[PDB]
Amino acid sequence: GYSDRVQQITLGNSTITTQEAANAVVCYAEWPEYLPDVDASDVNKTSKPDTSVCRFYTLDSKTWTTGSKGWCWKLPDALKDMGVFGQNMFFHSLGRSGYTVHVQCNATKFHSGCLLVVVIPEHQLASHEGGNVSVKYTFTHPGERGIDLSSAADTIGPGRAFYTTKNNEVGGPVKDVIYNMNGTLLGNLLIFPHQFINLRTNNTATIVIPYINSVPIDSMTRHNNVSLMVIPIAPLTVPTGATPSLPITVTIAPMCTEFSGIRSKSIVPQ
Amino acid sequence: GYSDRVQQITLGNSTITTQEAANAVVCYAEWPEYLPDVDASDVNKTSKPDTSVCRFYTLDSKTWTTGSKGWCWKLPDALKDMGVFGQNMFFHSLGRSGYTVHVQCNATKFHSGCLLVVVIPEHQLASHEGGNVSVKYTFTHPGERGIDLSSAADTIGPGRAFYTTKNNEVGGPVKDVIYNMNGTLLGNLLIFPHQFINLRTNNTATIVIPYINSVPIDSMTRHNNVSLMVIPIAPLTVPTGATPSLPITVTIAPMCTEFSGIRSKSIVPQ
Amino acid sequence: INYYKDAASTSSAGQSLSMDPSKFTEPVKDLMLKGAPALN
Amino acid sequence: INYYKDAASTSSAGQSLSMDPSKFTEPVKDLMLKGAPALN
Amino acid sequence: TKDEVNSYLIPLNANRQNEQVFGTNLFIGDGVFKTTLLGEIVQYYTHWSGSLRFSLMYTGPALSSAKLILAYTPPGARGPQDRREAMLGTHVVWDIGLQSTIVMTIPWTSGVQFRYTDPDTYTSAGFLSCWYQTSLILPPETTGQVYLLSFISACPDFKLRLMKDTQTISQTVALTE
Amino acid sequence: EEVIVEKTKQTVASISSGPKHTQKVPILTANETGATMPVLPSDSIETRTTYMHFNGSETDVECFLGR
Amino acid sequence: EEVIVEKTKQTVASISSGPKHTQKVPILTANETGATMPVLPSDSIETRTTYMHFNGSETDVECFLGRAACVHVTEIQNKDATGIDNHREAKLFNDWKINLSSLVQLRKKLELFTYVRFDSEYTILATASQPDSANYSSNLVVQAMYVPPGAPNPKEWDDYTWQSASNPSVFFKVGDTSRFSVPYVGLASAYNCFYDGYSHDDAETQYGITVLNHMGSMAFRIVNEHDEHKTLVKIRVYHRAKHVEAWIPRAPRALPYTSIGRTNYPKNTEPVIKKRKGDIKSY
């Protein structure tokens, strides 16, 4: 009867449906949960909005062409302007959350291509200028549009639409895909929670992320706990006559969200 | 030991202290509470932010002069731009809440004056043009600044600073204090939950308001459940040499707040 | 046996013996059995 | 265990565990309760 | 320009509405705290944690009145520029009366469970500010400024770690008889 | 914020304290008495439960003057 | 290849497995799920029974990060202090901003994980030499003082700061060695090897693990006064982790490092993957 390909996820007033899934990854076999008293430090009663923030938010879609190199989003940064979650993020000095990420990309049984969907905890990026330069806030907190690696990649060496937000401007991150933007190799990214969207097999990837950090709760605007990466390993191959592109959509839903230290809105650069 | 003059109210991360109180009124002897299943209609799981919204918010202070006629605030309108409460108000189509209102005004044992602090449920205002004219949204939803009755009053007949927001402009409410802006008499306002700030006795008034409505939950941007009114009955009399004015401060705290029907931000006139 | 007041002074802790790779090798939601078809 | 005749030779004494700030924070004659009015 | 008793006196002006009374960041190892008993002992340690006790005592005439709002602003947003901004964080509305002192608490609000005592750090516990909630009203035959006295102490939850030398004492030559 | 609980011989740093509306006002006092009232955060804001996980051994006078 | 059998408390490496012809196919799977099925040799070939005779103790994180590694090499001098306006630039004393990222060997091992919690065992070795004219070699004593953040920094080699009334310090002979333990001293529950966050000073924006790495410094000096000759003293600091706990394994470093704290690599760097002499079919 039931299969691992057909799944339904319901969070708040939103529901995700999939008929071509490949099971679902729960990071380190840990489901998200609220902060227990035994691990708490901050004495303030936390705020748990529940269904008003723990729901699915769909980001802007991306276009996967043969020249694509990859995309990168940072959480909770990617959701900073998303409904009540974003608002709570700016009014509180502290917060913690888990997530359920859902990456979508459908095609036909004539298409070829493979996407690596990986979640990297504490993904500290390298600077484009190299040596002893630090990445400026703007580039390290790109928002819902994320970072397009195709602006200056490693694999075939291209410069798609940009080089960065405007162009190669002081403080941008090194966009070499093969080096994971941090001096390690792409092939080893599999040590982190991941799934593949192999067009011949599945059309979605689902990863549930618990709160991962060395502190019980943390500043949400100054720290990005995880980084979501979508990278084309096997290039996109469309059938004869078809458009050489395919859309990719990302939908994220915060889970077990807690907020603390409420004051006025946060002052961030840009 | 303890007295009715000294009280402390703690909501969320805010605390109110008073040493010159006159007990506290709990509207119709009913403390605020969450909506029980037996009275519910809307099937959506409601969101209860708790401490992030159920806290004290202080509005802009008013100046009580000898020519003052009164002030009027509408809830939840008065808190529409207040922190996380305001945000939730705009993102949800439904919501319900109780309140604890705290009106402040200190002087010396040489001063005279008396303020009536009253909470009026469903305070439907009358139009300035009279006859068959309706009050325009802007004037009926004044925000945290409230409505100054001294712009065109009943008692001694003055025109303090304005006539309305800009001036007597099509759609303004009739500002006759003696007629409660609705064709009834001021002296009968005591049938509604109230307290007096008699300068010789007390310097604060406290009223706790439960959710009052004929529906279990309602639209917060299109409906004002209660109206808070501060009216000088016995005029302000300052001692020889002193400034003929006194500040009045209003602090309101939402209680047992629930939100439902979350979508994008509401579109309201102005 | 006992001549140090602080625990940081002691030597190595020794082997854990509780090494389970599951959380890394099989962090999937639905139980995947070896031998059964990966996706039904 | 025991190789010194004088007590001055031994190491540190260790924590007291009986730390009560009362004699410094509340050295008042009449009992002052938190919550009750400081002066009646 | 020099150390004086006036350094401890917070001025309070009559008949002013929304204005600020005072403000300060919460670097307990520097600023106005450096020379207090708490600040002095805290400087002998590298890490700190716990809640602070901030007290305010009114010293004006018995026949005067006032209402102030004390606010604690956690880090992330700068110091409050107006009462509306301050009122959004942790605060206490103080009514001056028979009981002369208000004891506001600065609750431990932090993600990491310990903070550095070092003032040369990027961020502290946050900000502290005081505003006229109503205004100071002086009785007849009285004029001028009245003063507030501020106090600081640690709550029972306070923690201190890693002993270090303090930068509040030094010498160039050994002292002689 | 009281001092004793059963689990692991743990001392509580702060107790769970909700909204208040009382005539018992712990945050008002008189410093002219020369006393410092033991006011905790649960006396002025809503708090959750936390544990000390700390004995305060490094601030003992033995350690302070013991190097 | 299951894990338990009775004889000698022996774990079996492989079980006896014969021919197969089934509908249960363990060697077929779907890697898109993100899982690695525990396929053993008995799932694809006929196997005999063998025992492990192995516990895997040397690969325990305690052992892996549990040996001393050089984390710093500094240099101080003993010479005439007269006329010198900067004792630190003259090397009469020197301070080391404590971190385990300066020397690459240990750095790469630590960076295999995201969070690590452990106690530290330090060993400091001091050696001397006299590059110029000397009639003899002098015995010297070195003082290593820990200056936590917030504590006054030494400005001169004979400052008042060297009294070390509260700062912990060690005194030992040059040619000899120093050793002490340090309990886990992080503010958080574990140290961060990486940090995807920044800080604000109203002046400059700092990004990365540098934001959290705010340990103190180690000030070194020769206690003795000067002799007729100049003495060069090299100081080597070694670190050994004890009672180790590690979290979130990572992709190992592939490219050379450029600076402390940053994950930057040099531009115009050589390829890290070996290129074949022949083609993809070569052996």
Ligand SMILES: CCCCCCCCCCCCC/C=C/[C@@H](O)[C@@H](N)CO
């Ligand atoms: C007598 C002198 C006493 C000196 C005691 C202070 C030494 C402090 C030792 C802490 C060691 C640094 C721990 C941080 C490790 C991280 O750098 C790595 N996980 C990442 O590279």
